[PDB]
Amino acid sequence: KKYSIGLDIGTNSVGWAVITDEYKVPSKKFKVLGNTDRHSIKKNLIGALLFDSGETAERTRLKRTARRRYTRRKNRICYLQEIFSNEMAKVDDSFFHRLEESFLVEEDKKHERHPIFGNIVDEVAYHEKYPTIYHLRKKLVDSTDKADLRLIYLALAHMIKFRGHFLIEGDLNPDNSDVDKLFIQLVQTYNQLFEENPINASGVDAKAILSARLSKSRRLENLIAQLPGEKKNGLFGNLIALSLGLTPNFKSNFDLAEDAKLQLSKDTYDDDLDNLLAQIGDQYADLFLAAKNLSDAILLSDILRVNTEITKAPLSASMIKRYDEHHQDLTLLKALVRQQLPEKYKEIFFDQSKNGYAGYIDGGASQEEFYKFIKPILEKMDGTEELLVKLNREDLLRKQRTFDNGSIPHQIHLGELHAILRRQEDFYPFLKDNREKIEKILTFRIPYYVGPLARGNSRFAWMTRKSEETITPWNFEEVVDKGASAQSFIERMTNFDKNLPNEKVLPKHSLLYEYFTVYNELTKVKYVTFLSGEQKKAIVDLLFKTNRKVTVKQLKEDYFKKIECFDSVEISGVEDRFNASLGTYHDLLKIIKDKDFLDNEENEDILEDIVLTLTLFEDREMIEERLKTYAHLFDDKVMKQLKRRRYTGWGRLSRKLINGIRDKQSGKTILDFLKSDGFANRNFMQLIHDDSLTFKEDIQKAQVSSLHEHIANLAGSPAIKKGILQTVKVVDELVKVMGRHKPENIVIEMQITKHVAQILDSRMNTKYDENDKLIREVKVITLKSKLVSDFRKDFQFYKVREINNYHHAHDAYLNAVVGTALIKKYPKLESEFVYGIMNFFKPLIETNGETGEIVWDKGRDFATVRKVLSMPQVNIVKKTEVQTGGFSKESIRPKRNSDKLIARKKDWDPKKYGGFLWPTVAYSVLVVAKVEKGKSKKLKSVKELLGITIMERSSFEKNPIDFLEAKGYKEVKKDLIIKLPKYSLFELENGRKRMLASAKQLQKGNELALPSKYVNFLYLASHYEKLKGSPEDNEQKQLFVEQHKHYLDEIIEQISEFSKRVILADANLDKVLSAYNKHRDKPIREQAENIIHLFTLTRLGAPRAFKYFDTTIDPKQYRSTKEVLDATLIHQSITGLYETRIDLSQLG
RNA sequence: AGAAAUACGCGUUUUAGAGCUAGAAAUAGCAAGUUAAAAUAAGGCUAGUCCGUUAUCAACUUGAAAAAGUGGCACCGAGUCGGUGCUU
DNA sequence: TTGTACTGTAG
DNA sequence: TACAGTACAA
């Protein structure tokens, strides 16, 4: 009658088991549908559901963003062509069409093959006169004669398309571009953080060292030699190193156990920086982005070598000079190789595969790979001294389109564009009429607070229009309602506090947030000669509001000796210094310099609105609008300074916590308790946890604000959200199985915010009374994994991950057993364990104590649990998933005559244009039909699977019949079409099971049910000297493992039986048997660890390459789905108890 | 603890950038190389400077869909579950 | 002309 | 880890 369900929720697995009050798993005869002979199967109420991990939105957001960038870039080109078209049509009628169709082959091209002029002589003349685009750009800047209109378009389109970055706001000035200025800014912020032992740099000339044409490392050592107090391995040297790009290490600076690689030029630098500042705190982030902008300045200086001259456009002239140096160096290298080392000349300049110059240009070799190939050649060669030093400084044979161009601000391209539009202004009137239009095309950037320029059909947009017309950069300022868009931006990008929802979160740079973290840091301090309120106020007013960094030595020298007259004070609450600080307070104090205004409690809301404004917005305009209200408090000299300061990040707590709700008896908020708490000071989470105060009850009553509609608003990690949803479906189906009877109690695995117990309690308990707020029909019991792991450890019920996935179901059943025993043994800890200690397991018969009911015997319950742990039939279910995502791999392969290449566009034949490969199959489809085979055409019937990929999924689901007819299948029987997703289960002879991984790939789907004594012996054979228990238990397991050495031979016999039954890998079987026989005399450690990896051959899933002692066994791949056309297809529910077996041999 | 807004620079693919000489040639010697256009998930319709890789999904019967419904129990055993006995 | 085996590939 | 490319058995 009464029964319990245990669960074990994981990221990739959900275990489940049904127990009775006698700790026995029931077994029932389940009905099975389908056309098969079987009508009822005996199955057990224990099993596990296995599924792929849920992915985060991150990659999808990245591709979405990149796709938006591509669309907006193409729209910029469309705007420029729309400007040029009316005049260009009189000069060249088919110029834009030739640019559009330049991709196509000459056969598919309606116009001439030459894009720019359409005549070969003029094209050759163009490429002789301007070998790069930068030559044309520099001429158009530096020529006063009338130029061709199409060349002007090419230059303007080139710098509008590749327009550089927007990181520097306003005009370009030496205050944020000249390397000395941001170097002084870096030393100022470094001294601001490290107030103690400052580093001074006044007589140094940073443009002399950092902009010098020398090697990077020697520049680092020269700069260190200019600073006697520092070393190259020091923190300042490390900062200068990653400003230069040497990939330095921060582990030595902070005694980190793990290495601390950081590089700005890496493909993704934000992530390792994020972990690094998670380890050391966020105060240093000012120093890191100061180093990043110093790197931007250094790179911008080195690519602009013609910065010494104001006689030309800098970028174009420098790039021309780079081309000239590349040419005159390449000809020298060619001659010197051809004369002084004639062998391997063809390997360098002809081969185009071995990272030579031909591999540098015509192959896929980077700059540093080419350098690493050529530096040994130059070292063996002679006369290369002047050439090798360029490679040492990475200035040898550089290209014009490299990764270093990401430092170029958009102001340089804007200046070149303005110079061209002013040099050609009088010659073309439509350039004079549209100069501001073209400059607005280049310089317009959609604000962060506007987002997608949609019209209600976007999940992501929030922008509110003031008119209904097309948005262009020219009329953006008079169409979008910036106030309403900014307000909606505020309402959407804010997070909400987890402890108290519906509440606006404070910024992490908020003033009261810094007050909270300072006070929570400071109230847990004890001094020996706990603080009182006046002492805390004096310390904060004297030290925290005077310097950012407060150490123990400053506090004992400046407060107790100066004010309290205490000579010797011992402090134990804080070790060396106070990690939290009033950074925002001192920043604003530096800005306005009106300190008593900051000390007034009436100004808390206005200052909080100011910091909220700079936390939300990054662009200048709405920042200016939002605090233009406060211009009558103080004047422009501070306005122009606080309009440029920006904050980033958000806190975890809301204002309604800190100085919000109030205690009924004490009359004090959280922060009011942090002001004074009597003798025994108590912390924030201690104030929450204390049940005497009404704070906890106020938190819990305000916590509350179809099944899928109830999931559609949930919060938490995306990987475990899948686990909660699947465990809800599993619990629902298990209730459905046993005659709709609800369990007596449900045990949930784990301090951890288990909202899953709240969900299950809400779904099971749906009844209430006028006096009882909720009836506890089902008691969701929450247990920690420490208890069950200890229970496995001490009573010899061990487990491994490598043998089979029975450990999930075994864990779930053990959770159920320990939870039921715990609630039944101590009923008074029910409120402790049910939402809303080990020693009794080890008298030989235990009782309830208050009642005569028997809760645990050390007799037949141990035999029952050992039988269940040794019980072979466990319902392991792999969730059948329709594959979604990108329909192919993103690499674009060259042209070939294969028909397997996927077309990159509708009109682009992949035989001539290349295309993608490796498509992803969403699901497979069983078809029976007739296929026209043979030269003498007859109709042969055939039954075979066909893979429907993600790209053809929609075209298949609109109308399958003509989609199958387009593939050659005719006379298709429509009713026999069976959709087969991934991990579809098939059963063959001798109980052999195969899981459908694709249309042409199978997987192992059988389970090795190894007995419990063998798994105990295999666990005990491993971990030979790392139990860390007691010496007597240690030696107990040593003799236990040594006198049963025949168990390994019995176990390998078990593998040789099981893999001969269902795996059918005979060659690998002979390899493992030979390697076991010839490595039989090795000790138990290596033998045990390698037989633990030996189960990879028989593990369910894809065949993976395991390894023995020395030999490595290649996997046996099942690249043939021909055997499942006559197998028995199994349709398993989420628990696998209900099945529908379809015999495919009776079809077709 | 998730989710979202704005941009950059690469990279890949095809084409354009006239290759020369000896050549019956399968080819050999020499010269040259740095750039640009276009696409960057096929595409979709409410046609927006929007959307298209996250989440969700065993089978069958109703239902456009949403969604709802469909599968006896006890005992003895265990190689992926089997057997025995009542019941409609 | 159709299946298997081994190695390489993948923003 | 499924798919691609090349190399053999019939």
From Swiss-Prot:
| EC number, UniProt record | 3.1.-.-
**Residues involved in Mn(2+) 3 binding:** H1079, D1110
Region (PAM-interacting domain (PI)) residue spans? 881-1148
Xref: Pfam families: Cas9-BH, Cas9_PI, Cas9_REC, Cas9_RuvC, HNH_4
Region annotated RuvC-III, chain positions:
751-884
Q: Name one GO biological process term.
A: defense response to virus
Cite the effect that the entry attributes to D811A: Only cleaves 1 DNA strand, probably the noncomplementary strand. Processes guide RNAs correctly. In vivo, loss of Cas9-mediated CRISPR interference in plasmid transformation
Chain residue ranges for the region called Recognition lobe: 54-705
Keywords noted in UniProt = Antiviral defense, DNA-binding, Endonuclease, Exonuclease, Hydrolase, Magnesium, Manganese, Metal-binding, Nuclease, RNA-binding
| Annotated spans, ARM | 54-71
Specify where the region named RuvC-II lies, as residue ranges.
706-750
Q: Which domain of life is it from?
A: Bacteria
Region entry RuvC-I, spans:
1-60
Cofactors: Mg(2+)
Substituting H807A results in: Decreased DNA cleavage. In vivo, loss of Cas9-mediated CRISPR interference in plasmid transformation
Q: How is it used?
A: Coexpression of Cas9 with an artificial single guide RNA (sgRNA) which fuses the crRNA with the tracrRNA in human cells has shown it is possible to target and modify DNA sequences of interest. Cas9 plus the 2 sgRNAs have also been expressed individually in human and mouse cells to achieve DNA targeting; cleavage efficiencies of the artificial sgRNA were lower that those for systems with the 2 sgRNAs expressed separately. Microinjection of Cas9-encoding mRNA and a synthetic sgRNA into zebrafish embryos induces targeted mutations.
UniProt note: domains: Has 2 endonuclease domains. The discontinuous RuvC-like domain (approximately residues 1-62, 718-765 and 925-1102) recognizes and cleaves the target DNA noncomplementary to crRNA while the HNH nuclease domain (residues 810-872) cleaves the target DNA complementary to crRNA. Has a bilobed architecture with a recognition lobe (REC, residues 60-718) and a discontinuous nuclease lobe (NUC, residues 1-59 and 719-1368). The crRNA-target DNA lies in a channel between the 2 lobes. Binding of sgRNA induces large conformational changes further enhanced by target DNA binding. REC recognizes and binds differing regions of an artificial sgRNA in a sequence-independent manner. Deletions of parts of this lobe abolish nuclease activity.
Purpose of the protein: CRISPR (clustered regularly interspaced short palindromic repeat) is an adaptive immune system that provides protection against mobile genetic elements (viruses, transposable elements and conjugative plasmids). CRISPR clusters contain spacers, sequences complementary to antecedent mobile elements, and target invading nucleic acids. CRISPR clusters are transcribed and processed into CRISPR RNA (crRNA). In type II CRISPR systems correct processing of pre-crRNA requires a trans-encoded small RNA (tracrRNA), endogenous ribonuclease 3 (rnc) and this protein.
Q: Can you say what this protein is called?
A: CRISPR-associated endonuclease Cas9/Csn1
Q: Which organism is it from?
A: Streptococcus pyogenes serotype M1
Lineage of origin:
Bacteria, Bacillati, Bacillota, Bacilli, Lactobacillales
